Design a protein around this nucleic acid. Structure first.
Ligand SMILES: [Mg+2]
Ligand SMILES: [Mg+2]
Ligand SMILES: [Mg+2]
Ligand SMILES: [Mg+2]
Ligand SMILES: [Mg+2]
Ligand SMILES: [Mg+2]
Ligand SMILES: [Mg+2]
Ligand SMILES: [Mg+2]
Ligand SMILES: [Mg+2]
Ligand SMILES: [Mg+2]
Ligand SMILES: [Mg+2]
Ligand SMILES: [Mg+2]
Ligand SMILES: [Mg+2]
Ligand SMILES: [Mg+2]
Ligand SMILES: [Mg+2]
Ligand SMILES: [Mg+2]
Ligand SMILES: [Mg+2]
Ligand SMILES: [Mg+2]
Ligand SMILES: [Mg+2]
Ligand SMILES: [Mg+2]
Ligand SMILES: [Mg+2]
Ligand SMILES: [Mg+2]
Ligand SMILES: [Mg+2]
Ligand SMILES: [Mg+2]
Ligand SMILES: [Mg+2]
Ligand SMILES: [Mg+2]
Ligand SMILES: [Mg+2]
Ligand SMILES: [Mg+2]
Ligand SMILES: [Mg+2]
Ligand SMILES: [Mg+2]
Ligand SMILES: [Mg+2]
Ligand SMILES: [Mg+2]
Ligand SMILES: [Mg+2]
Ligand SMILES: [Mg+2]
Ligand SMILES: [Mg+2]
Ligand SMILES: [Mg+2]
Ligand SMILES: [Mg+2]
Ligand SMILES: [Mg+2]
Ligand SMILES: [Mg+2]
Ligand SMILES: [Mg+2]
Ligand SMILES: [Mg+2]
Ligand SMILES: [Mg+2]
Ligand SMILES: [Mg+2]
Ligand SMILES: [Mg+2]
Ligand SMILES: [Mg+2]
Ligand SMILES: [Mg+2]
Ligand SMILES: [Mg+2]
Ligand SMILES: [Mg+2]
Ligand SMILES: [Mg+2]
Ligand SMILES: [Mg+2]
Ligand SMILES: [Mg+2]
Ligand SMILES: [Mg+2]
Ligand SMILES: [Mg+2]
Ligand SMILES: [Mg+2]
Ligand SMILES: [Mg+2]
Lengths: 85, 93, 200
RNA sequence: UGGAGAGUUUGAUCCUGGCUCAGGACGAACGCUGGCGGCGUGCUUAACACAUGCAAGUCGAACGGAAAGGUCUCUUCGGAGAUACUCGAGUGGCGAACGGGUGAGUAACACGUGGGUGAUCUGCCCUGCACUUCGGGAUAAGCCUGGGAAACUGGGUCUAAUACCGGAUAGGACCACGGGAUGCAUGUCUUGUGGUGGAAAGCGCUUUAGCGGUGUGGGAUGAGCCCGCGGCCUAUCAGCUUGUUGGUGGGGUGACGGCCUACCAAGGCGACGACGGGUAGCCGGCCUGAGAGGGUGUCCGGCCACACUGGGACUGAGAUACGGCCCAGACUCCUACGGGAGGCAGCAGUGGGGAAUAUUGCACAAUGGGCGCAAGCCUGAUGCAGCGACGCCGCGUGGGGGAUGACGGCCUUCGGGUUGUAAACCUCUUUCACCAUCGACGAAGGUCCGGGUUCUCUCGGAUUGACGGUAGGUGGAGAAGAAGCACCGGCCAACUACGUGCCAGCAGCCGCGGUAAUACGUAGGGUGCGAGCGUUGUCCGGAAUUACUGGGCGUAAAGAGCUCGUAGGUGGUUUGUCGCGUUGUUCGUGAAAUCUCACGGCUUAACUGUGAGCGUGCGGGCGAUACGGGCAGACUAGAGU
């Protein structure tokens, strides 16, 4: 653009979007994996993967890649999802 | 942040001023949350007044005044009686 | 702006000797002009207009200023004509006329305009200022030993002094007891026709 | 505490009834004229295209580094020496969503007013409590190079941080089971048990310089959403709606929600105007009016929408993201033809349209804002300043005398009248302009150096104002430099003469001028104004000529040809209750500014400030039930059998 800050600001925006992309790819692939676990109803791997799923979800919440309200929404969602498995 | 700033409501050749509480992200002649004083710098000593009992309320809750208001705040003495200084008394004339 | 013209002409036109003493008046009491003697049509609007012109040219007041004074007189509580006369008296050139420190209005006005006057020791040069209660009507200290200002002494007995102002001795300073109401106001003119006029 | 009428239909009349006029106002324009000051105000048309300049920046107390200044040096006599204050380029944080403009679009919870959020978010600000614990790996920048016209970009080493990643502990995540409080149902808070989980950081020091960070509870503020009421034309727009109406399970959101989705049912809106067409930003306000109303939404202020046209995401607490990004489209420019750049409805300013609206100025002096421990830097916000009589207010362009009532002019009944104390003349004083000079308040302010018990405070010293040598005071000179505009038959205030002779022409209206014009041109006089006066246009008034206040329908315009009947409007007598209308009181709100009253100050005024009304309305509580309304009844008088 024109402003000395604006070029630097965009150079930071690309960094933000890419490092954010790593995270949301991780959590999307992981919620899909949890759905694979729950749909099968193994209840052993489904029982033991929560230690990873809520772990990385709360990591995401702490780093602020997403926001704690929807974080709670999703974690309640899968909690009640296995509550009927 | 909530600011106690000096808002200009004067003429070309007279800068009358009137002190309130307002959000920082607001223009001068906008909506002030509540009016707590006035300042006319045209008489010999001054024309100064602050409410002196909502100013304490705003300073306690976190309404930080600006740099020209901080001086006037020591003058009315509310700063000293809010910070526990030995010069708590007002010092206007 | 000021009229800056003949006075007995408009005294004739208004058919009333506005100023105090005029030999140019009373010789030809009819209005001037080449048709000076014709029988004028006594219309209501005619006498109202001549009457408002009387009220203006008596005090040397201009049109929209007279307007503004009338629109605040109407707004003031009670009546309107008494207060309009009150305020047009309270103009300080009329104050000098009542104090007797002038011969005619056009130099009572200029003694103010030309800065020979402090009120509360404040240099005033606008002749439209309104005197308040208890106020002092004073002169500059350096005005002394000037020809009109010293003929102003022995000419203080031929004209009666109103009771709303007090004039004193070797310090030629007036004290305004109060704002004069109705009676001590000299009345060369009946004054309800101004009131009627501006409802048109 | 506030309301005016006149002309015009007839031979004459009285009604009805239009038309016209007398008033006021503008973001105004045009004609003539023109001194200044104060204070306001200035693209109303093309949301048409923009040359040129600035309008968003900040931190060396976060780090790697030494591009410039000065230093400790050597020493070429013009190079080396980062160690070193100082600091170019560079990494990160915050800001950039505030701030300013325009009103295109929008008839909409967009706006005004009042509420709900037990359905929500809110960086930096304040407060209460614990923690700062171990580590890792990259990368910029730099350096060596490659390609391309550039715009820009590929390759290889090398280095950090409050950048990134991995950890341990940590309740305000979750689930389940329970307590304890409250309701307004989904529900709300405080807790316990158990099982899961997620945070951080360092930077400086004259040796009591200091800046941080993180997890959270509560405030404050900003915001989001939803809803009752209100606010244009039109039926020569009557059928609109399928994610439409609802539900369930999900998804998604900060949050409820068809916001989205799978399934199921077939519902929702509308004659109280759906759907549609046209027009339009809305408002406190402004203009007018006696008010009710009518017109309008310009300065100011609040809200919304938009940013060349159209569509979309990102970061971040926060996005119509005007001076951010992605794409398409239209328009201007460079290209070496492969490719790229631009968006003034920001401050100016240019071109173009119009009847028409301005300086490519100064200062950050003040305030508001951004950043930094701070000094400090940025701020076309802001303060100002220039131009436009564009509007309001104020003030001058002399005053007192002055008859033989002078010359000249005009008329004339030829004796005179009129201009006219108006002039000549005498006499007096300089508001404004002229010259000279001093010279500001706006700054109990902003930094430095004396003293301060440290936070603080001044004894008291230097220096800092765009406005500006400006406003203002004083001295010098002499009426000396300073008036024009409109109109004169009635409305409407103001008349004679000469020139013209249905011609020129005037005019708002009805009318004038065809040989004697108070109505055309000129002169004189006069009137109303006056740095203003007139013409236009627009709006209100008069217009009780859309009538709620406040009108009418036999013959003036106006009773449907008649009846029945739908919605609607309206409804006899009486009893009891509800208290919706109505009504009383209080609380809250009805921002500020505006308007009114009283004071205060700018020399008065315009203008400003303060206190009191206004804010008519709305929400909650406590009263009432006379009238209207709902309900439960009763009567026979209306109505019907
Ligand atoms: Mg930066
Ligand atoms: Mg993948
Ligand atoms: Mg959910
Ligand atoms: Mg007839
Ligand atoms: Mg006739
Ligand atoms: Mg009529
Ligand atoms: Mg001219
Ligand atoms: Mg001015
Ligand atoms: Mg540097
Ligand atoms: Mg921006
Ligand atoms: Mg903005
Ligand atoms: Mg415009
Ligand atoms: Mg390294
Ligand atoms: Mg860590
Ligand atoms: Mg843990
Ligand atoms: Mg910091
Ligand atoms: Mg479906
Ligand atoms: Mg559903
Ligand atoms: Mg759901
Ligand atoms: Mg439009
Ligand atoms: Mg009326
Ligand atoms: Mg507006
Ligand atoms: Mg405008
Ligand atoms: Mg444009
Ligand atoms: Mg975000
Ligand atoms: Mg731009
Ligand atoms: Mg502009
Ligand atoms: Mg033109
Ligand atoms: Mg500044
Ligand atoms: Mg400041
Ligand atoms: Mg200006
Ligand atoms: Mg002017
Ligand atoms: Mg003009
Ligand atoms: Mg004036
Ligand atoms: Mg002088
Ligand atoms: Mg007349
Ligand atoms: Mg003739
Ligand atoms: Mg004529
Ligand atoms: Mg007109
Ligand atoms: Mg009417
Ligand atoms: Mg009309
Ligand atoms: Mg009628
Ligand atoms: Mg009838
Ligand atoms: Mg008829
Ligand atoms: Mg009939
Ligand atoms: Mg019947
Ligand atoms: Mg019927
Ligand atoms: Mg019916
Ligand atoms: Mg009924
Ligand atoms: Mg009844
Ligand atoms: Mg006063
Ligand atoms: Mg006053
Ligand atoms: Mg006021
Ligand atoms: Mg108000
Ligand atoms: Mg019967």
């Amino acid at each position: 653009a024109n402003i000395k800050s604006q070029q630097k600001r965009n150079r930071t925006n690309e960094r933000a979007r890419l490092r954010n992309k790593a995270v949301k790819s991780s959590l999307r692939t992981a919620v899909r994996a949890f759905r694979e676990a729950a749909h099968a109803g193994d209840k052993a791997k489904a029982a033991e993967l929560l230690a990873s799923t809520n772990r990385k979800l709360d990591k995401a919440a702490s780093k602020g890649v997403i926001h704690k309200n929807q974080a709670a929404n999703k974690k309640s969602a899968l909690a009640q999802a296995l509550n009927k498995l | 942040a909530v600011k106690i700033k000096l808002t200009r409501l004067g003429k070309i050749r007279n800068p009358q001023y009137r002190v309130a509480v307002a959000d920082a992200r607001t223009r001068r002649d906008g909506r002030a949350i509540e009016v707590i004083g006035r300042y006319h710098p045209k008489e010999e000593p001054s024309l100064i007044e602050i409410n002196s009992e909502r100013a304490q309320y705003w300073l306690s809750v976190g309404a930080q005044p600006t740099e020209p208001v901080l001086k006037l705040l020591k003058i009315t003495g509310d700063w000293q009686k809010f910070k526990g200084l030995p010069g708590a008394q007002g010092r206007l004339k | 702006a000021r009229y800056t013209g003949p006075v007995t002409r408009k005294s004739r036109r208004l058919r009333t000797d506005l100023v105090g003493g005029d030999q140019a008046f009373e010789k030809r009491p009819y209005p001037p002009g080449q048709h000076g003697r014709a029988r004028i049509k006594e219309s209501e609007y005619l006498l109202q207009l001549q009457e408002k012109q009387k009220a203006r040219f008596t005090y040397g007041v201009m049109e929209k200023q007279f307007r503004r004074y009338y629109e605040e007189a109407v707004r003031q509580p009670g009546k309107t004509g008494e207060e309009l006369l009150k305020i047009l008296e309270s103009r300080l050139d009329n104050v000098i006329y009542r104090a007797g420190l002038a011969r005619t209005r056009r130099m009572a006005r200029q003694l103010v305009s030309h800065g020979h006057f402090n009120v509360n020791g404040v240099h005033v040069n606008v002749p439209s200022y309104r005197v308040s209660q208890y106020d002092i009507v004073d002169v500059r200290d350096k005005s002394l030993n000037t020809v009109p200002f010293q003929i102003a002494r022995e000419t203080a007995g031929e004209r009666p002094i109103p009771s709303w102002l007090q004039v004193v001795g070797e310090r030629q300073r007036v004290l305004i007891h109060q704002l004069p109401e109705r009676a001590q106001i000299d009345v060369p003119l009946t004054e309800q026709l101004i009131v009627e006029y501006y409802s048109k």
